[PDB]
């Protein structure tokens, strides 16, 4: 890379990270979608 450097993009990380497994920086998987079914919220007034 000193002779043929890589192309620069803005989004490319400026600081490489090594394997973080087993540390507080590890990756925890999670669902990235939002809630599908919205639940009716009962009225907060005393009715009758």
């Amino acid at each position: 890379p000193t002779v043929k450097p890589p192309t620069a993009r803005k989004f490319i990380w400026t600081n490489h990270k090594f394997n973080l497994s087993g540390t507080p920086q590890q990756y925890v998987p999670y669902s990235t979608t939002r809630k599908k079914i919205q639940e009716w919220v009962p009225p907060s007034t005393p009715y009758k």
Binding site: P29, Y30, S31, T33
Partner: protein
């Protein structure tokens, strides 16, 4: 003719005991014997030729970790293909599944006339091509 020396069994064929299927997936499952309906989005009719047998839909839920669709139904993706309704029914009977058959829906023949688009005294005249 065939000379194996044969017996005569007059009972109905019933193979549930020898199939290895658990109890709950024979007594409680309702099969649907049907010809699939043509997908309305297309005009091809080659997927409406054969009879199908599918099972009632049971619960799917969200996996707590990734949100994937989890199931406890071993027959959820099970589909069988038959040439006739009588073939599909016989298979369900010997396997002990209860079934609701649905008769094939055949498109009716229509009367198409290109000359009717320019009729002289009828409403079939088109205002555009």
């Amino acid at each position: 003719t065939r000379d194996t020396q044969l017996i005569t069994v007059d009972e109905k064929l019933d193979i549930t005991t020898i199939t290895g299927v658990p109890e709950e997936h024979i007594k409680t499952r309702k099969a649907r014997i049907f010809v699939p309906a043509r997908n309305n989005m297309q005009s091809g009719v080659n997927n409406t030729k054969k009879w199908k047998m599918e099972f009632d839909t049971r619960e799917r839920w969200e996996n707590p970790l990734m949100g994937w669709a989890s199931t406890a139904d071993p027959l959820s993706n099970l589909v069988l293909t038959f040439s006739t309704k009588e073939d599909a029914v016989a298979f369900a009977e010997k396997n002990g599944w209860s079934y609701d058959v649905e008769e094939r829906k055949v498109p009716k023949p229509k009367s198409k006339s290109y000359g009717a688009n320019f009729s002289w005294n009828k409403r079939t005249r088109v205002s555009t091509k």
